[PDB]
Amino acid sequence: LEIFEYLEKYDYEQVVFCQDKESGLKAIIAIHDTTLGPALGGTRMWTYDSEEAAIEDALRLAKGMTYKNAAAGLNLGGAKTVIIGDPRKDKSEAMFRALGRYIQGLNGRYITAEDVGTTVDDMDIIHEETDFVTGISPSGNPSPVTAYGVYRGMKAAAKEAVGTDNLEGKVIAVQGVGNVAYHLCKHLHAEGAKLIVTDINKEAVQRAVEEFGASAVEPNEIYGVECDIYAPCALGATVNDETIPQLKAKVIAGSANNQLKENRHGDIIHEMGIVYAPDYVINAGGVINVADELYGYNRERALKRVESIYDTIAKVIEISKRDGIATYVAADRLAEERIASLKNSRSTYLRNGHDIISR
Amino acid sequence: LEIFEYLEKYDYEQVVFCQDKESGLKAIIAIHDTTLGPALGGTRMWTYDSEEAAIEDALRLAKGMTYKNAAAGLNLGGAKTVIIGDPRKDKSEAMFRALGRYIQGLNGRYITAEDVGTTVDDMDIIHEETDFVTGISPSGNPSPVTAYGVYRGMKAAAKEAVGTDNLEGKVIAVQGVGNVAYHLCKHLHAEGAKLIVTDINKEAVQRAVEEFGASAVEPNEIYGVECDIYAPCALGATVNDETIPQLKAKVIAGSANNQLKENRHGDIIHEMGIVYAPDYVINAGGVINVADELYGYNRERALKRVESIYDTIAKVIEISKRDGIATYVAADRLAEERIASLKNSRSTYLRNGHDIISR
Amino acid sequence: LEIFEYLEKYDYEQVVFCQDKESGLKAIIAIHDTTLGPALGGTRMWTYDSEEAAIEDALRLAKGMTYKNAAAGLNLGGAKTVIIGDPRKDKSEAMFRALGRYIQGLNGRYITAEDVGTTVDDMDIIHEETDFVTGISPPSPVTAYGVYRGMKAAAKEAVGTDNLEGKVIAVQGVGNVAYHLCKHLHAEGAKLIVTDINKEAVQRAVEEFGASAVEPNEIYGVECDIYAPCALGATVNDETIPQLKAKVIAGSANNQLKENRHGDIIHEMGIVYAPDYVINAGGVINVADELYGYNRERALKRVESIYDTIAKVIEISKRDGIATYVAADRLAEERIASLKNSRSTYLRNGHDIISR
Amino acid sequence: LEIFEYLEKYDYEQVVFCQDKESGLKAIIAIHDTTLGPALGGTRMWTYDSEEAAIEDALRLAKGMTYKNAAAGLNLGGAKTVIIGDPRKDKSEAMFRALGRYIQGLNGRYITAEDVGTTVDDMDIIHEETDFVTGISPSGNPSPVTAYGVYRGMKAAAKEAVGTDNLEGKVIAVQGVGNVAYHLCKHLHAEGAKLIVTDINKEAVQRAVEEFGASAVEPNEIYGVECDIYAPCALGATVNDETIPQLKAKVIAGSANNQLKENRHGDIIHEMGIVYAPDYVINAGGVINVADELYGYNRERALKRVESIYDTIAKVIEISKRDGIATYVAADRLAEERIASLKNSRSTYLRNGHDIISR
Amino acid sequence: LEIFEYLEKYDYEQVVFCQDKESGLKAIIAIHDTTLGPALGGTRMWTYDSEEAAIEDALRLAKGMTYKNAAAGLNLGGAKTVIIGDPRKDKSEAMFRALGRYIQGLNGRYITAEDVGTTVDDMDIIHEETDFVTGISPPSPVTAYGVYRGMKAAAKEAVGTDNLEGKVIAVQGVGNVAYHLCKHLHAEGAKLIVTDINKEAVQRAVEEFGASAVEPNEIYGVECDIYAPCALGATVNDETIPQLKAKVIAGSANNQLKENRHGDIIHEMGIVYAPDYVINAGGVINVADELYGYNRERALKRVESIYDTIAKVIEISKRDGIATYVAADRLAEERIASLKNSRSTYLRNGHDIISR
């Protein structure tokens, strides 16, 4: 529990322990940076090994969002809530009214939304207490936008590796047929590309073959498949010392988070001629979407900021050459350079300054 | 006139006598609880036995709404206005402008709406004076939502008694073909269920037979009809020592208020293997609707809160077993436990706290 | 009781029963009229024979304040709260926080202040919940100074001069208000005959103002020129009026006349009655000036004007040959009414005592 | 120029002389009453005999609107502006920006709109300066609503005179085929009624015959035509000692203002068995419309307040019997009794009272 | 540490870790309860053995303030900030601007003020960023005047009179608060035996108040009638309690009782303990009155009331046969609870100490 030492290391702002005995709520709202504006980050509700793990998670994820929101061109800092709970058992109206009030008693420093373990019905209760909450569908599926996001990511990667942003003829190995993966396939299919798929659900793989004339490989095998592009759209740590030498594709580009199992994995991929579209730059679609909800939802302008994931990857790719460093590093430096440059250009005084909260 | 003694008994908040000689308005606004938020409750305008009766009515009904709104998952306490008048004769613009001002001079503690004796044209005049009033159609028929509400109620009752929430094959005895009953039949018919009906209007029963291939029994007889579900959608006190031994159905579930003639009636139904969907949990549809009008009307989210009447009955049914007590008691304890639990979880300070009135 | 029949009779606005079980608060806020503005009226906390009595009291008193505030030239209607309880035993922080919130949930229609049974400390708790409460930050000497000015205008009609030299003043009760009244009366060269249920209090008076100290049930028949009831009401009845030597009544006490029949015969008896609720108006006029934002000088100048109010009541009592208490009722009425008309013009930014 | 004497007579509130030399604006805003709320009344721009006449006009018209708005069930007092000018020659942007500012410097006491001599383009300039102005079409034709207004008026008159509110078979003599008259005919035709028409334009009468199988009589003759209902939809003073003995119809009911040439004309019509629908109760449609614009335009609720002109005439008709007085007097007493009754019922204090201006 | 388990135990609300690398700020704002209103509690800046200790402290102290503010009749819950650092070395403008912003980004849930390690100049920088900070514009003599009034009510139970004539007062420590306490105690005719880690300070006392000057570890066994601990806590332990001559303890020091076991035996020993956090309430009651808008007289009158608070704590200690520190805990609890109910009625324009 060396909290302050860790906080001072990556210069976190606040870790806000919230408790309401009536409900049983035990939430850690962790806020890494608010340089660009309010911190945005969903409420994850999972059971934990130990309280220490739940704190380390909140912090990990929050520092994450700082960089996602940065690169995604949002005016939002990094935060995340972790409730300690079994979503299937430990939820109540109280618990979300409780947390709602605590969020309102940060008065726009933190804006939540759904994550692992939380429903929109959940956020709909939080909304009873505050408007510092997004992903309210009653006001739908973020899934197709995250996917459209990856499609645009994939292209810029293809153009660097393969020589054209056209995906016609190209053979795409899609790990997992989730909601995000399915809609990704949809675009990939209808742009003249051939899909090899796999999933822990077989029914889902049959949906894919049936719809997109696709090939079906076993979970274990997806890595060694002869193809041009590997799209991890399942779990993370899918790019490790086991999978990387197995890998035939010259482009990685998926929806999954923490594609790289350690930081030294992305380093060898670079030196291997593989072109990695970094996780948190591509799946930015989902955040960019709920983020546009706050301005007041506009389908066109939303998808145009997502459209731009192409140009974000393109710059990350460029910098990875201009500085000879793995794409995930260029991405970190891209976000950093942005946060920093704005911090200067906007340090001019105004008594009526504008932000996403003044909508 | 032991007002304070009665008020202190069930811990009522205010009884607000309002008078305007010009109009002749004599209204009792009674407010039972405001723990969850503003009290909501319609303006009933009926002629009374005596002034004492009009006061006892206001109080009875208001304590009612506290529990309806509670269980219905609303953020609203219990109130009701009783005007003393003959709606057909004693109404004026004045009388509703009068009452409107008195409601505005409670500044959101009480939110009215239509009841017995009051039109929307009535509320439309009140609205000239305040916005603490709902059921403004010019801004339509609540009737189908109340009904959709009962349909969902009926199911959860069926699943406990009969073993499935499917109503196909099931024979439903529908007392009264009101607007609410008609639209209930509609759903029941179009879900493969057989209707035995009755009403003091025969033309109305012919509408039913003609539309839903239904059977027509005399008012007096509806009780003794061989069937699976009894739906009182007429008057209250329809579940008394006269009707309960007559009863063939193993599920009661209607739109009517005060289905039980005394509290000791629900007690024997429980011990008789009959499954009572308690009045004020099921017909909650009508309130839940005008209640959603205040947030700003949203057809989908409105019907989804109504949809949930299923899960409310399901919990009431559960508690009635988990604690061996009649369903109307489990309902009272469900509402109580809710009011109470929120009172705690929300006692955290905020200088900008949110409520239905901040929309 | 047939509440609504009584409400419709004198066209009352609201009777607001308030209850909070944790404290035990049982308060009746009765609001008679708000034509001139927010109703003002103190919170009386007294034990009552029966709930019906507590309701009749609230209504009685509230209709009272409508007329006091009217004639006193305030922009305020009539209301009064009656708590049911024993002030010495049944009070709590809760009970006043409770009532405070209920007052705030009338959003300026009712403004309270202290009465029988309520302390400033009481209003100070109510103030934690609302600002529709006065008499809490910088009344006895003002009520008194109020009567002093009243007395004079009465003297000038009966006696022929607003000078009180030569005049013998019979002061019933040496309460807080009476003491400070005597002070002014003494230091203007008038002669004081006093009495009270406390004798040590009466000795304070004799000692300070060279007064005579007479038995409670003698004060009436004392050879005197002015009678100042500053104790109990119903002190002007079939037993006291023929006993009365003074040709001017002018006191701090409320309901000086035992029935309305009594003021009528006093009129025909040559005797000049300064009507109760026009004079003791000092105390209200004071807490009322607290809301505009307290100003010692302007406050005392509105009190000073009780002279001119009595003077007009006296005038009308001649111009119409009617008892002074009737001219006072008609003075308040004619005011309420005249303004109701002159102010019925629309404004989207209308001003009231609450807009400051 | 005995202004104050005249003002004190009918207890007018303000006469506001406004002048701006740059433009040349010479406007008299006259405000008769504001008991019910802001005074509403259009800006008439006509050339005048003499300045004295222009003042007398403003006052006449303003006292008018007090009574129109009253009976029409609006929350608005009576006012009118008269500009002294030749609309064809003397208008400028300036002149309407000028007047706009003067209206804003009455801060909601007066709400203007179009009248004789003023365009919506005119009000659109005034709107640049204030929002105390209605009839802004860019935000269309009031004409059909005024007409629908008369149709409903006519009926209640018919039911009293003729014995049914049905106009089938009934022969209607329509003086003038204006925009209002045309749309009146439209309804009258499509409800099984026969139209005799006339106008100073013949082309317009041909439109009518062609569309509604109507009969065409000369201007001079319309009065003596055998028919059931006389609808003056042209000029006023059309009900004088010349026209009244000529008159065959047993119901007068038109769109025209000041149908009666003197007050003693309506008196003899009553004693003659003719049923007069009083001018300013029926053509109320046009005001009721622009009046509903301020609440925020709602086609349905607008037409429902117009619909009610039936019930207004019905009451005026009733009172004309219950008190044996001409219908125009019952109308004056109806408006008076309304103004008065509300003045009492609303004299209760509120610190947040509501009006048409708080929308 | 298992933070949440501890938080759920005494139903804490928030523990808010704040960090700003440029300054080095490492602050724990802990908020125990906000039922009565915004939490109030000073910013303590002390060096700590380990981060875990700094967290336990914040929580300890915050739960403290909940009870202080409750019993002291404030409309405020319990919180406390602990900065981790060496006040003499580690402070900067930044560090207080930093914390200021974090406080503003709790939007009135927490109101700070000075504590151990923080200056007014410190709060004056915080004030540049927020107004959820008090004790900055016009505490030692008030805390003391607070104890004086406490002492009396204790005397009246043990001694039989609220007069302190004849009474011998043993004053441990001549700090700022102690000095000014002695002042009042001297000038009321009571006899002072003193002691401190500074002797020149004790000579100031003897010189000014004709006192006896005894060794630090003698003060306890001194023949005296009242013991005033005005230095360190845990001064009421198994070593001092049997040594104790006085039948009244009443001091400015916090945590006078070393364990809860100690107050229990003092009760059964005839001895009358004025509980720590009810008396030194003077200092809080003062900065608390700063927020309503400072009024010297009304401020001192809420302090004056510490008399009546002790008097009630004394009463309950008899009516229930329980140590005075328990009656105090139950007094605060019963208050928090009773209001939570009486105020659960809805208002859209609710009032709090922050709405002025």
Please give the full DSSP string across A277-295, using - where no structure is assigned.
--HHHHTTHHHHHHHHHHH
Query: Residues E132, E41: contact at Cβ < 8 Å?
Result: no
Residues with Cβ within 8 Å of D54's Cβ and at least 6 positions away in sequence, in order, are D26, D28, D48, D82, D84
3-class SS at E308? helix
Which tokens belong to D18? 């406004």
Residues with Cβ within 8 Å of E95's Cβ and at least 6 positions away in sequence, in order, are E20, E23, E24, E25, E83
Which tokens belong to E161? 């009179």
Among chain E, residues having any CB pair with chain B shorter than 8 Å are: 13, 34-35, 37-39, 77, 107-109, 340, 344-349, 352, 354
Query: Among residues D88, D96, D139, which one has the least CA distance to residue D116?
Result: D88
| Long-range contact set of residues A221-227: C-beta below 8 Å, sequence gap at least 24 | A222/A173, A222/A175, A222/A196, A222/A198, A223/A247, A224/A248, A225/A173, A225/A196, A226/A171, A227/A171, A227/A172, A227/A173, A227/A196
Residues of B in contact with E347 (CB under 8 A): 107-109
Which tokens belong to B236? 């209250």
| Residue A344 falls in which region: left (phi positive, over 0), alpha (psi -120 to 50) or beta | alpha
Question: What are the DSSP calls for A72-101, one per residue?
Answer: TT-S-EEEEEEEES-TTTS--HHHHHHHHH
Which tokens belong to E254? 């916090």
Angle between helices E282-293 and E140-158 (to 10 degrees): 130
H/E stretch holding B145: helix B143-161
Alpha-helix runs per DSSP H in chain E = 3-9, 51-71, 93-104, 120-126, 140-158, 176-186, 199-209, 260-268, 276-279, 282-293, 296-304, 306-319, 324-342
Which tokens belong to B131? 């916005």
Which tokens belong to A125? 């209760």
Which tokens belong to D14? 């303000």
Beta carbon pairs, B and E, within 8 Å:
49
Query: Residues C80, C103: contact at Cβ < 8 Å?
Result: no
Q: In Å, how far are D56, D74, E112 from E138, measured between CA atoms?
A: 67, 57, 16
3-class SS at E79? strand
What's the Rg (C-alpha) of chain D?
20
Residues of D in contact with B357 (CB under 8 A): none
Residues with Cβ within 8 Å of B212's Cβ and at least 6 positions away in sequence, in order, are B185, B186, B188, B189, B195
What phi and psi values does residue C276 have, to the nearest 5 degrees?
Answer: -40, -65
List of E strands, chain A: 14-20, 25-31, 39-40, 43-46, 77-84, 110-111, 171-175, 194-198, 215-216, 229-232, 251-252, 275-276
H/E stretch holding A33: none
Query: Residues B100, B128: contact at Cβ < 8 Å?
Result: yes
H/E stretch holding C202: helix C199-209
Query: Among residues E219, E235, E130, E117, which one has the least CA distance to residue E168?
Result: E219
Dist. CA D310–CA C67, nearest whole Å: 45
What phi and psi values does residue D119 have, to the nearest 5 degrees?
Answer: -95, 170
Nearest-CA distance from C94 to chain E in Å?
A: 6
Residue E83 β-bridge partners: E27, E45
| Long-range contact set of residues C182-185: C-beta below 8 Å, sequence gap at least 24 | C182/C208, C182/C209, C182/C211, C183/C144, C183/C208, C183/C209, C184/C144, C184/C145, C184/C148, C185/C148, C185/C151, C185/C209
Among chain C, residues having any CB pair with chain B shorter than 8 Å are: 1-5, 7-8, 11-21, 24, 26, 51-52, 84, 102, 105-107, 109
Half-sphere exposure of C60 (CA within 13 A, CB side): 10
Residue located via tokens 């059909």: D144
Which tokens belong to E316? 């309950």
Half-sphere exposure of B23 (CA within 13 A, CB side): 28
Query: Residues D276, D266: contact at Cβ < 8 Å?
Result: yes
Chains A and D are in contact, defined as 3 or more C-beta pairs closer than 8 angstroms: no
- Give the mutation candidate from D341, D348, D352 for the B interface (greatest B CB count, under 10 A): D348
Give Cα D71 distance to the centre of its chain: 11
Cα B121–Cα B127–Cα B131 angle in degrees, nearest 5: 145
What phi and psi values does residue E215 have, to the nearest 5 degrees?
Answer: -65, 150
Dist. CA C317–CA C311, nearest whole Å: 10
Nearest-CA distance from E103 to chain A in Å?
A: 9
Binary contact (E19, A2; C-beta < 8 A)? no
Alpha-helix runs per DSSP H in chain D = 3-9, 51-71, 93-104, 120-126, 143-161, 179-189, 202-212, 263-271, 279-282, 285-296, 299-307, 309-322, 327-345
Cα A135–Cα A137–Cα A142 angle in degrees, nearest 5: 60
Dist. CA C179–CA C159, nearest whole Å: 24
**Residues C107-133: b if buried by 16+ CB within 10 A, e if exposed:** bbbbbbbbbebbeeebbbbbbbbbbbb
Residue A314 β-bridge partners: none
Give Cα A136 distance to the centre of its chain: 18
Nearest-CA distance from D344 to chain B in Å?
A: 6
Alpha-helix runs per DSSP H in B323-358 = 327-345
Residues with Cβ within 8 Å of D203's Cβ and at least 6 positions away in sequence, in order, are none
Dist. CA A331–CA E79, nearest whole Å: 42
Dist. CA C2–CA B51, nearest whole Å: 7
| Long-range contact set of residues E287-291: C-beta below 8 Å, sequence gap at least 24 | E287/E40, E287/E113, E287/E134, E287/E135, E287/E139, E288/E40, E288/E69, E288/E72, E288/E74, E288/E76, E288/E134, E288/E353, E290/E134, E290/E135, E290/E136, E290/E137, E291/E111, E291/E134, E291/E353, E291/E354, E291/E356
List of E strands, chain B: 14-20, 25-31, 39-40, 43-46, 77-84, 110-111, 171-175, 194-198, 215-216, 229-232, 251-252, 275-276
Dist. CA D81–CA D45, nearest whole Å: 8
* Beta strands A251-252; A275-276: pairing state: parallel
* Beta strands D25-31; D14-20: pairing state: antiparallel
Binary contact (E346, B107; C-beta < 8 A)? no
Closest CB to E51 among A1, A26, A51: A1
Dist. CA E213–CA D205, nearest whole Å: 121
* Beta strands C226-229; C248-249: pairing state: parallel
What's the Rg (C-alpha) of chain E?
20
Among chain D, residues having any CB pair with chain B shorter than 8 Å are: 73, 75, 298, 300-301, 304, 338, 341-342, 344-346, 348-350, 352-354
What phi and psi values does residue C261 have, to the nearest 5 degrees?
Answer: -50, -30
Chains A and C are in contact, defined as 3 or more C-beta pairs closer than 8 angstroms: no
Residues of D in contact with C77 (CB under 8 A): 349
CB atoms within 10 A of CB D159: 18
Dist. CA B77–CA B34, nearest whole Å: 4
Neighbours of chain E (3+ CB pairs under 8 A): A, B, C
End-to-end Cα separation, chain D, in angstroms:
40
Write the single-letter amino acid at A98.
A
Neighbours of chain A (3+ CB pairs under 8 A): B, E
Catalytic residues of C: 80
Give Cα B329 distance to the centre of its chain: 16
Can you state the percent helix, strand and coil of chain B, rounding each to 5?
Answer: 45, 15, 40
H/E stretch holding C329: helix C324-342
DSSP state for residue B133 in the 8-state scheme:
B
DSSP state for residue B158 in the 8-state scheme:
H
Residue of D nearest to B106 (CA): D350
Residue numbers preceding breaks in chain D (C to N > 2.5 A): 139
Residue of B nearest to D344 (CA): B22
CB atoms within 10 A of CB E144: 26
Query: Residues B38, B104: contact at Cβ < 8 Å?
Result: no
Binary contact (E7, A24; C-beta < 8 A)? no
Dist. CA C77–CA C342, nearest whole Å: 17
| Dihedral, CA of residue C331, residue C332, residue C337 and residue C342, to nearest 10 | 80
Query: Residues E150, E302: contact at Cβ < 8 Å?
Result: no
Dist. CA B26–CA B53, nearest whole Å: 13
| Dihedral, CA of residue D69, residue D70, residue D75 and residue D78, to nearest 10 | 50
Dist. CA B1–CA E134, nearest whole Å: 51
DSSP state for residue C81 in the 8-state scheme:
E
DSSP state for residue A47 in the 8-state scheme:
-
Binary contact (C352, D351; C-beta < 8 A)? yes
Dist. CA C228–CA C246, nearest whole Å: 10
Write the single-letter amino acid at B292.
D
| Dihedral, CA of residue B142, residue B146, residue B151 and residue B157, to nearest 10 | 170
DSSP state for residue A211 in the 8-state scheme:
H
Which tokens belong to E241? 């309690």
Dist. CA D302–CA D299, nearest whole Å: 5
Nearest-CA distance from B47 to chain A in Å?
A: 40
Query: Residues B279, B256: contact at Cβ < 8 Å?
Result: yes
Nearest-CA distance from B359 to chain A in Å?
A: 10
Residues of A in contact with B304 (CB under 8 A): 138
Dist. CA C76–CA A78, nearest whole Å: 56
Closest CB to E11 among A21, A84, A109: A21
Residue B44 β-bridge partners: B82
Closest CB to B3 among C17, C105, C109: C17
Q: In Å, how far are B208, C356, E79 from B204, measured between CA atoms?
A: 7, 62, 67
Closest CB to D34 among C35, C37, C346: C346
Closest CB to D352 among B22, B23, B104: B104
Binary contact (A138, B338; C-beta < 8 A)? no
DSSP state for residue E117 in the 8-state scheme:
T
Residue B276 β-bridge partners: B252
Cα A249–Cα A251–Cα A255 angle in degrees, nearest 5: 110
Give Cα C76 distance to the centre of its chain: 14
* Beta strands E168-172; E226-229: pairing state: parallel
Alpha-helix runs per DSSP H in C269-295 = 276-279, 282-293
Dist. CA A69–CA A71, nearest whole Å: 6
Dist. CA B77–CA B110, nearest whole Å: 9
Number of H helices, E strands in chain C: 13, 12
Query: Among residues A67, A3, A72, A82, which one has the least CA distance to residue A33?
Result: A67
* Beta strands A43-46; C212-213: pairing state: unpaired
Chains E and B are in contact, defined as 3 or more C-beta pairs closer than 8 angstroms: yes
Residues of A in contact with B346 (CB under 8 A): 97-98, 101, 129
Dist. CA E233–CA C139, nearest whole Å: 47
Query: Residues A72, A291: contact at Cβ < 8 Å?
Result: yes
Question: What are the DSSP calls for E142-171, one per residue?
Answer: HHHHHHHHHHHHHHHHHTSSS--TT-EEEE
Dist. CA A72–CA B9, nearest whole Å: 60
10 Å CB burial of residue A348 (0-12, 13-18, 19+) is exposed
Query: Among residues E53, E41, E194, which one has the least CA distance to residue E132?
Result: E41
Query: Among residues B48, B105, B107, B103, which one has the least CA distance to residue B80?
Result: B103
Query: Among residues C77, C87, C147, which one has the least CA distance to residue C116?
Result: C87
Residues of E in contact with B38 (CB under 8 A): 346, 348
Closest CB to C22 among E338, E347, E350: E338
Among chain B, residues having any CB pair with chain D shorter than 8 Å are: 20-23, 25, 92-95, 97-98, 100-102, 104-105, 107, 128-131, 138-139
Residue D76 β-bridge partners: none
Catalytically annotated residue among D26, D63, D68, D80: D80
Residue numbers preceding breaks in chain E (C to N > 2.5 A): 138
List of E strands, B160-228: 171-175, 194-198, 215-216
Beta carbon pairs, B and C, within 8 Å:
81
Write the single-letter amino acid at A320.
S
Closest CB to A129 among B304, B338, B354: B354
Residue numbers preceding breaks in chain B (C to N > 2.5 A): 139
Binary contact (C101, E343; C-beta < 8 A)? yes
End-to-end Cα separation, chain A, in angstroms:
40
Residue located via tokens 């801060």: D107
Query: Among residues A289, A261, A269, which one has the least CA distance to residue A147?
Result: A289
Nearest-CA distance from C87 to chain B in Å?
A: 18
Taken in order B42, B46, B51, B52, the sign of the CA dihedral is negative
